[PDB]
Amino acid sequence: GGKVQIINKKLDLSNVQSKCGSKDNIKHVPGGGSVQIVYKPVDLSKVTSKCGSLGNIHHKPGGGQVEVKSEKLDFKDRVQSKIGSLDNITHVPGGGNKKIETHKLTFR
Amino acid sequence: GGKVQIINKKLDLSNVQSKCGSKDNIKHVPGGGSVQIVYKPVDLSKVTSKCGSLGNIHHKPGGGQVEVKSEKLDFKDRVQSKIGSLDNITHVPGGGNKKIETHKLTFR
Amino acid sequence: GGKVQIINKKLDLSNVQSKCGSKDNIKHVPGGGSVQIVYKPVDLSKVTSKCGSLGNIHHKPGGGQVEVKSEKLDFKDRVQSKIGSLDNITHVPGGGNKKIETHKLTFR
Amino acid sequence: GGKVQIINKKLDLSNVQSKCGSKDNIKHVPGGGSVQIVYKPVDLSKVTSKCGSLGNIHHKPGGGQVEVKSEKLDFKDRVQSKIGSLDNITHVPGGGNKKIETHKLTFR
Amino acid sequence: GGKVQIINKKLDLSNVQSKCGSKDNIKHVPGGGSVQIVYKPVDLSKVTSKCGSLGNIHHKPGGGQVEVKSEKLDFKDRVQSKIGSLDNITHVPGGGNKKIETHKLTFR
């Protein structure tokens, strides 16, 4: 039949850390005429801390066993960002600026 | 038949941390004429802390067992952002700016 | 038949933390003429802390067992953001600015 | 027949934390002419703390057992945001600004 | 037949926390001409604290058992936000601003 014996005695574990920084952040995006953001992240990330923990315990004798673990991701996304025209735009996201001028003079 | 014996005795565990930073944040986005944000994130992330914990305990003898674990994601999204035209726009998201001018003079 | 024996004795566990930062936040988005936000996040994230806890305990002998765990996500979303035209717009989200002017003078 | 024996004795567990930050928040969105927000998040997130707790206990012998756990999400949403035209707009969400002018002078 | 024996003795558990921040909040959205908010979140989130608690206890011998746990979500929503035109709009959500003017002068 068999046997699986695990003996754990007098275990002292400490200071198990898992850290991920600030992610997926969009900051300070000024547009003079327009801003177009298409924001579709797909997040399956894992930030895990395991300390003195086991996995799944399965006792399943007998033959013909089938174990399937599948993870399928399909991306067929269609993203279109269109702008026809832009003109005569003054954009000053800086500070302490003086005498910023834009001139469009047309004589048809 | 078999046996699965796990012995845990005198276990001292401490300070198990799981941290994720600020995520998926959109901040400070000024648009002179317009802002178009399409915000569709898909989040399946895991921030887990396991300390002295086991998995699932299954005692299922006999053959012919089928175990299927599937995770399917399909993306067929259609995102369109359109702007026809922009003109004669003054955008000052900065501070302390003086004499910012935009002129559009047309003589048809 | 088999046996699954788990012995836990004299376990001292402490300080199990799970933290996720501020997420999915949209802040400080000024639009000179318009703001169009389509906000459809899908959240299946897990922030879990397990300490001295087990999984599911199943005692199901006999063959021919089928275990199916499926998770299906389908995205066929259709998002359209349209603006026909923008003109003659002054946008000052900054502070302490002086003499910001926009002029559109047309002679047909 | 089998047996599943779990022995837990003299367990001292403490300080099990699960935290999620402020999420799904839209703040400070000024529009000069208009604001269009389509707000449809789908939230299935879990913030769980387990301490000395077990799962489901099932004693179901016999063969031919079928266990199906399915979670299906389908998205066929159709979101349209339309603006025909915008013009002659002054937007000052900043503070302490002086002499902000917008002029549209047409001679047909 | 089998047996499932769980022995819990002298368990001291404390300080099990589950926290979720402020969510789904829309704050400070001024519109110069109009604000259109379509607010349809779907919330199935769980903020749970389990301490010394078990799951469901089922004693159901015999074969041919079928256990189906299904969760189906279908989204076919149709959201339309339309504005025909906007013009000659002064919007000052900031404070302490002086001499904010908008002029539309037409001679047909």
Provide the CB-side half-sphere exposure for B11 (13 A, CA).
Answer: 26
- Kindly state whether C55 is in contact with chain E, defined as any CB-CB distance less than 8 angstroms: no
Note whether D54 and E5 are within 8 A (CB): no
Note whether D47 and D19 are within 8 A (CB): yes
- A28 DSSP assignment: -
Name the residue of chain D whose CA is nearest to C25's CA. D25
Touching chains, B (3+ CB pairs < 8 A): A, C, D
Question: What SS3 class is residue D77?
Answer: coil
Number of neighbouring beta carbons within 10 Å of residue D20: 25
Determine the residue type at E46. Answer: K
For every residue of B13-65, DSSP letters joined together read EEEEEEEE--BS-EE---BSSEEEEEE--EE--EEEEEES----EEE--SS--
CB-nearest partner of C62 from E4, E50, E63? E63
Residues of chain C with Cβ-Cβ distance to D28 below 8 Å are 27-30
CB pairs under 8 A between A and C: 16
Name the residue of chain A whose CA is nearest to B15's CA. A15
- B81 DSSP assignment: E
Cβ of B33 within 8 Å of Cβ of C34? The answer is yes
What region does E46 belong to: left with phi over 0, alpha with psi -120 to 50, or beta? beta
C30/B33 Cα distance (integer angstroms): 10
D17: tokens are: 């934390």
Q: Which of D19, C53, B6 is nearest to E18 (CA)?
A: D19
Q: From residue E41, how far is each of A40, B74, D94, E44 by CA, in Å? A: 18, 22, 31, 10
For every residue of D27-57, DSSP letters joined together read E---BSSEEEEEE--EE--EEEEEES----E
Residues B28/B29/B34/B39 CA torsion (nearest 10 deg): -110
Cβ of D39 within 8 Å of Cβ of E42? The answer is no
C84/E11 Cα distance (integer angstroms): 68
Determine the residue type at D1. Answer: G
Cross-strand partners of B105: A105, C105
| Length reported for chain D | 108
Name the residue of chain A whose CA is nearest to C42's CA. A42
A34/B33 Cα distance (integer angstroms): 6
Cβ of C52 within 8 Å of Cβ of D51? The answer is yes
A33/C91 Cα distance (integer angstroms): 10
C22: tokens are: 């501020």
Cβ of A57 within 8 Å of Cβ of C94? The answer is no
Q: Which of C77, C76, C86 is nearest to C38 (CA)?
A: C77
Q: From residue B63, how far is each of C2, C62, C64, E101 by CA, in Å? A: 15, 8, 6, 82
Residues D22/D24/D28/D31 CA torsion (nearest 10 deg): 180
> What is the C-alpha radius of gyration for chain A, rounded to an integer number of angstroms?
30
Cross-strand partners of D53: none
Q: Which of B51, B100, E102 is nearest to C8 (CA)?
A: B51
A1/A3 Cα distance (integer angstroms): 7
E25: tokens are: 């909040």
HEC assignment per residue over C49-97:
EEECCCCCEEECCCCCCEEEEEEEEEECCEEEEEECCEEEEEECCCCCC
Q: Which residue has the tokens 């799981």?
A: B18
Q: Residues 57 to 86 of C: which have CB under 8 A from any B CB?
A: 57-86
A68/D74 Cα distance (integer angstroms): 24
Cross-strand partners of C102: B102, D102
Strands C57-59 and A78-83 turn out to be unpaired
Question: What SS3 class is residue A89?
Answer: strand
Provide the CB-side half-sphere exposure for D28 (13 A, CA).
Answer: 14
E70, exposed or middle or buried, with CB in 10 Å at 0-12, 13-18, 19+? Answer: exposed
Name the residue of chain E whose CA is nearest to D18's CA. E18
Question: What SS3 class is residue E95?
Answer: coil
E6: tokens are: 């769980």
C57/C63 Cα distance (integer angstroms): 18
Note whether B18 and A48 are within 8 A (CB): yes
Measured in angstroms, the resolution is: 2.2
Note whether B65 and C65 are within 8 A (CB): yes
Provide the CB-side half-sphere exposure for A84 (13 A, CA).
Answer: 11
D40/C39 Cα distance (integer angstroms): 6
